[PDB]
Symmetry: D2
């Protein structure tokens, strides 16, 4: 036997950081969950009980906090790049660092119509994420994403013209509910190192904002022929608006809302044009995926 | 042996309803999870295999959908009152109906600064709930609540002057983070029946709004001596603003954010006035409760 | 306004304890999650920012660990009684302690047919719990329970003879699946204090074992007329086997498994006597409850 | 823009199946959650609203049930192979089927020391899984796994000799707790099609059993130098015992149990040799991974 692949580190590292402006009194908070996994010349820790090659996961945890103290934690693409670069530069025998960051929402409260200087609300479990893979000799590969963005439209979704055979029972429809949890990923051009990442820093927040905006507007305005067709429109627009993105990935569940036939009860009409009360289905669910790139 | 208490019914009944304005094109959606449990002269179903006294839970489910089709589902205090009244009036031998409703957020989207007619976002897992107990001969008892409202303030929380003995290690502080998940309940005066509930319908949305507003503003503005002291201020203000409320209950976790001493590393200063990076603690957590009533 | 009720403390306190037998090498582990909430002359902490009456929740946490170090943690009824007694005796102004313990399973592994001295498996998320309410001047009130015991029987469940009216669609059946998650509680006679609890210590593990055994055997052997009827049989037997129990409570979901009619496809027969493939339903679910006491 | 990758289908399809032996009365149950995602000449569903190429996800769901009715559902490697083969053979334009199955435990109950013919218990949330990728022209690729196997050993884990630098605070130890949730995967030699899978059917249950047995015995008996070293031993033994496995993957969290220094309280000794009460840490956690193959 032989080790074919190995990575190790610390997961579920919760981190908070505050910024305090001493002139204005305005405080700003950031909260994330971080995972760092390392690769390198570490196989003898597996095969020969050689712990000398192990940068302890406890030390990886310490390093996350120290790096957050000494550097900005925003945008997460930059923080992850700084963090991963540290491990491959500090340790000769570590050749890759894989950094995953989940950013949690703390939105400033408005109190009597005014932004409060130090109070925040978690307006949803929607996340902003990054996966930053720092590989010695091969730059920095960043995937940015939004996830847990849950939406519903009550009309202007259709599904007809699909294949019909002996396994098919689904009726065609020209007016249905469409609800999903959006998981959208934009994959950046490889960066040569930390200097190139830094050179693009404003584009990370701007591209996240674009991806979110395009998602919401396309979902709301597309009279959808299918989830497939709608998600492709989203991807095409994001690629048109940021040339440093190479691909856009969507993964969308179709969270079904079923009509309820009540005509057995006093002739109640609750289907078709008369449909008002629906049964949300927890499972099963459609799951639709695509990766869109440049033609 | 003998049955001392018994209730049964259908839980986790997911319900969606849409309202469509045919003049304006504007659609409005509601989504809830409903539980209905019945009590009455049902002990022989337990003791003698007498199913004749059982209104089947499947039929209770059907009834929830039928009632949603025939009545408004908002405010949930009214829907729950209609639903519970149905069971005790329809079935001579059923003497109480216990209706729990969890309302899920579907907030209308703004697209290019304009409200969209049929697209919605789940802006958080914060819930609006009701518990409506309809008891024959004893009216309708309603508890309304908000839950899952997650907040954080980065300063203007203190905790000093607590009891100190041989079990105490906690340092006094004059500046800490305070974060919680708000669970707030307002308990209404008993209503004699459905007519009295209907007579107060506008007060249900208005009192929910007040409770939410008071919670947020008091949390943001109170330089908190303790969770105890801050939550009491919230309750007192809600009682002052709605005379048909008899009591207000809060249940608040203290979701700790711990300082991280980094001075072992290059003399880094990250405590006290220099504290910037903190470790959010998943557990344990303080848990603080009170019920406030009229003096 | 005035405080009508108040309790506070530390929740989600995870605790592990090991016992090591230095003669045999055999180690035994216990793991729990503890909550302690206190009541007493504490209202001024809410109304007047008087923290002097607050035994800090951090100190409550410390006390849990200290008490686990100095006392047995098993049976949990005894540990909870020791812990709650400490708070009301130590602090003159604290008059009640409410202790909830969730015990997690660590079952010793058998390796090559032999019990291993120090290795354990979590054989299910089934829990053993206690609620111990220690109230000054009013003894110790204990509720013991098992929860998260998930079972299924594939036949020998029936449901016919229920009420049928214009809200009913459910077909009668003489052979269905029955699956539930058992939540069973046995409520002890009040104990006058810690000495009386200690005097009954062996009965706590023995009654838990009886409750579990009766649950499983009755579920497996009762050709069930209803969940109501089956759960009553369980309760009656537990009360017959431990005179120091005053009541037994069950709360049982009916986790439905629906037949799937496949006759639209090649005349496939999958209902009634031919039913082989079923659709487990995540929601909704029946929910059946009773409390049984002594006649 | 252009579609670079696309797959779609039905997720979270819950399936139950019963086998009834009409001679003996013995019933046997199986429960799974299935996901099927298809790939093929489907890009025009994304780019041109062409639903004619879509085998509806609802039809995929129907097909799962139909296939379970007509074929054995065990071992899951075989069921998944049958299911995936169906889609690529039935639909000329579908060229890959990706089938994920999670198998849920229903272990037969022993009642008064005897196996019951039709009653079962969920003895843990441990799962047995498969990922079966059926690719036209490229056979069938199967990954089998066990997951959610949660274990703890109270001694005979060590961690010393790791790298120590200015980021390190962790003390070396020669006696610690080790607890993990085992996720173990064995990757089979490619199979040319369904006939070859069928030719090996008994090896699927036997290899799962071996993987489980080796995991448990190695965890219990290895005086562990590190998680790395222990997991490698497990993998090497599984590869030695089944030549049709090409690689074994482990992913193991290190679920920390921290000592609690109580010496501030009455000189209580609870560290080192005196350590009895520990604080289980929910987060962060080490995360250790490797893939082991044949040298
Ligand atoms: Na390096
Ligand atoms: Na009645
Ligand atoms: Na006292
Ligand atoms: Na094909």
């Amino acid at each position: 036997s032989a080790v074919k692949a190995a990575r190790y580190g610390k997961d579920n590292v919760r981190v908070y950081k505050v910024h305090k402006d001493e002139k204005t009194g305005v405080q700003t908070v950031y909260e994330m969950t971080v995972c760092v996994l390392l690769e390198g010349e570490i196989e003898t820790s597996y095969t020969k009980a050689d712990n000398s090659v192990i940068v302890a996961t406890d030390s990886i945890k310490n390093t996350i906090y120290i790096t957050a103290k000494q550097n900005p934690v925003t945008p997460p693409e930059l923080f992850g790049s700084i963090l991963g670069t540290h491990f491959i530069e500090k340790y000769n025998h570590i050749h890759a660092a894989h950094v995953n960051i989940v950013c949690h929402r703390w939105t400033r409260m408005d109190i009597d119509g005014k932004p409060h200087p130090h109070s925040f609300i978690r307006d949803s479990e929607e996340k902003r994420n990054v996966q930053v893979d720092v590989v010695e000799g091969k730059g920095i590969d960043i995937k940015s994403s939004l996830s847990g963005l849950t939406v519903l439209k009550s009309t202007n979704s259709q599904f007809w013209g699909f294949l019909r055979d002996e396994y098919t029972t689904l009726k065609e429809t020209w007016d249905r509910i469409l609800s999903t949890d959006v998981d959208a990923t934009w994959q950046w051009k490889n960066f040569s190192g930390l200097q190139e990442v830094r050179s693009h820093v404003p584009k990370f927040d701007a591209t996240w904002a674009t991806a979110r905006e395009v998602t919401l507007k396309t979902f709301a305005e597309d009279n959808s022929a299918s989830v497939q067709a709608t998600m492709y429109k989203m991807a095409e627009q994001i690629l048109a608006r940021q040339q440093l993105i190479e691909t856009v990935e969507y993964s969308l569940p179709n969270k079904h809302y079923f009509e309820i036939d009540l005509s057995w009860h006093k002739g109640l009409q609750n289907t078709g044009k008369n449909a008002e009360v629906f049964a949300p289905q927890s499972d099963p669910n459609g799951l639709i995926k695509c990766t869109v790139g440049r033609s």
